[PDB]
Design a binder for this molecule. Structure first.
Ligand SMILES: [Cu+2]
Ligand SMILES: [Cu+2]
Lengths: 171, 171
């Protein structure tokens, strides 16, 4: 009834582990650091991405300059589901002053079969906080003049670089 | 070693309960709904506010039109601490399709004595998602032209109205 992952940093060292427990039609997701000093204090975006690969200095499926864990692709969507929040979006990881963290959250947005389908999936911790695409259109505009969030914000939450990654399965 | 709270809706019905467990120099915060159908599906801002009052149609300490749980004041800051994230900021509450939710998160930003000091504190669930004041200044401006987040965003995360509130103590 469970999937797991061990998340590593770009240099290959272990950062955290995750459990995905499926029961009663939903997932209970637990993630916690395995030591100290490996994440910056504060809030970090946490999402499931659409390809089960955790390769430092890699290229995204549709192209771009290489970067950490980019071959994991974009946010995970259950087939036939578009828009925000993506199926793979999770509550943020709150990191204490010593770099340690623990989160439990729940979601009915995906199943075990979903995560094991196809190219599999990866859980990613971002460098920055997730804005959940909440950019008040009455008070903020894009630099082109359009009110509210742009496509990049809608699909990423502007959480920045990928600082830890684990493939979801049995690891 | 623990504080608790029972959170109610503006009509007085029970929505969720919370536990604040203090050990090893940090707080482990658990919050979960007590039934179904009482919060909207999706992500909800979750913060500790600076006054231990949960009054529907109330006025903020420094004034304004009445609104739900406004007498709880603004975000909680440990005395001598300013800026964002506020001491009272927590990971967001992720609500499933049926309105149910569970969150565990941790923080070293406050102690038991902090929460029991003075006018006490309240835990609040917001209607909207928290943006964590992440409004990319390279791509977004305030309508006055200044790049990045305004003071309101910095101090609230733009999470909107207060939909449930509990005073933190023994309740
Ligand atoms: Cu992500
Ligand atoms: Cu709040």
């Amino acid at each position: 009834q469970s999937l797991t992952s061990t998340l590593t940093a770009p240099d290959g060292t272990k950062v955290a582990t995750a459990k995905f427990e499926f029961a009663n039609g939903y997932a209970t997701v637990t993630i916690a650091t395995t030591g100290v000093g490996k994440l910056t204090p504060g809030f970090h975006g946490l999402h499931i991405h659409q390809v089960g690969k955790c390769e430092p200095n890699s290229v995204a499926p549709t192209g771009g300059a290489p970067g950490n864990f980019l071959s994991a692709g974009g946010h995970y969507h259950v087939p036939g589901h578009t828009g925000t929040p993506a199926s793979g979006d999770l509550a943020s990881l709150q990191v204490r002053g010593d770099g340690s963290a623990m989160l439990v959250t729940t979601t009915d947005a995906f199943t075990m079969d979903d995560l094991l389908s196809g190219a599999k999936t990866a859980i990613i911790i971002h460098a920055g906080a997730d804005n959940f695409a909440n950019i008040p259109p009455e008070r903020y505009v894009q630099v082109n003049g359009t009110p509210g969030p742009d496509e990049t914000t809608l699909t990423t939450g502007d959480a920045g670089k990928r600082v830890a990654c684990g493939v979801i399965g049995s690891g």
